[PDB]
Design a protein around this ligand. Structure first.
Ligand SMILES: [Zn+2]
Ligand SMILES: [Zn+2]
Ligand SMILES: [Zn+2]
Ligand SMILES: [Zn+2]
Ligand SMILES: [Zn+2]
Ligand SMILES: [Zn+2]
Ligand SMILES: [Zn+2]
Ligand SMILES: [Zn+2]
Length: 306
């Protein structure tokens, strides 16, 4: 692709975050024959059912609602859209490492704080280690913005798929482990075990048994013995810089661009990348990003950006 707006988690065969291809169909007949009135301009447009309307190009179809979906962009054929993931076209620095990276994950806190994907992984892994995931009755376990902002828990839990199979599996075990821990139990310390154990409260010797047979001291977690036993600070300025809608320096890509055909300067007023030239005698339809006539490659790779 020239430019990708969308990322999906591709199960088989990529098992990773990949650019996604946006598709649209008629919600009635399910064919690729829905001509939209207006192209999508944001994630709500392609996630909320029936939000967008058009006309099904069948003589047999009265359908007027669009249904959008994604495919992995890395190969021919339905994966889940990772809507918090954005291409970092304005070079916003990451909240925790302060480097410019792309793509980035953008929290739904009021500040729309921005974290690179490597830092997001490290955020996740640190919180898993330290048992600091956050419980929500309506969700299960998740994490909020790294800065601690309110009302910012991640709700589309498929985002934790981006951690990859092993850490995602640790995340999937966390709830059951936490049940044991909140009940006063202990997890087996043997790497590759971590069974949740519920020994009697006052017993220092814990044996992993129904597990792996390991007898450990629940106080120091080493092999059982008689006798006595032998990341979270977010910079305030870094956080202010790392906000999606904060004012930014001008990049090589200008925000007012000439019409590819008539050269007259053109302002963009929404997320959709299909531009219609405002000049009465021009009316060229073109991709804001690519400077070319509007086409289905641009639709699929970057119909809108955020
Ligand atoms: Zn794939
Ligand atoms: Zn139809
Ligand atoms: Zn980072
Ligand atoms: Zn935040
Ligand atoms: Zn064990
Ligand atoms: Zn000990
Ligand atoms: Zn024009
Ligand atoms: Zn384009």
């Amino acid at each position: 692709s020239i430019y990708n707006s969308f990322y999906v988690y591709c199960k088989g065969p990529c098992q990773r975050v990949q650019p996604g291809k946006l598709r649209v169909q008629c919600s009635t007949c399910r064919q690729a024959t829905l001509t939209l009135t207006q192209g999508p301009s944001c994630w709500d447009d392609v996630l909320i059912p029936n939000r967008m309307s058009g006309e099904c190009q069948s003589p047999h179809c009265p359908g007027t609602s669009a249904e959008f979906f994604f495919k992995c962009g890395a190969h021919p054929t339905t994966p889940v859209a990772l809507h918090l993931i954005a291409t970092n076209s304005r070079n916003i620095t990451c909240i925790t490492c302060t480097d410019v990276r792309s793509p980035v994950l953008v929290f739904q806190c009021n500040s729309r704080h921005v974290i690179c994907l490597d830092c997001f992984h490290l955020y996740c892994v640190t919180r898993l280690n330290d048992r600091q995931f956050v419980h929500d009755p309506q969700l299960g376990y998740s994490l909020p913005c790294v800065a601690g902002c309110p009302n910012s828990l991640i709700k589309e839990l498929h985002h934790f798929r981006i951690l990859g199979e092993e850490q995602y599996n640790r995340y999937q075990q966390y709830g059951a482990e936490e049940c044991v821990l909140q009940m006063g139990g202990v997890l087996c310390p043997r790497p590759g075990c971590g069974a949740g154990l519920l020994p009697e409260p006052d017993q220092r010797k814990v044996t992993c048994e129904g597990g792996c047979g390991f007898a450990f001291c629940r106080e120091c977690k080493e092999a059982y013995h008689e006798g006595e036993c032998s990341a979270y600070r977010v910079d305030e300025r870094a956080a202010e810089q790392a906000r999606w809608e904060a004012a930014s320096k001008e990049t090589i890509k200008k925000t007012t661009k000439p019409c590819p055909r008539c050269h007259v300067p053109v302002e963009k007023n929404g997320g959709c990348m299909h531009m219609k030239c405002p000049q009465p005698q021009c009316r060229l339809e073109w991709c804001w990003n690519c400077g070319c006539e509007w086409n289905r490659v641009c639709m699929g790779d970057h119909w809108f950006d955020v």
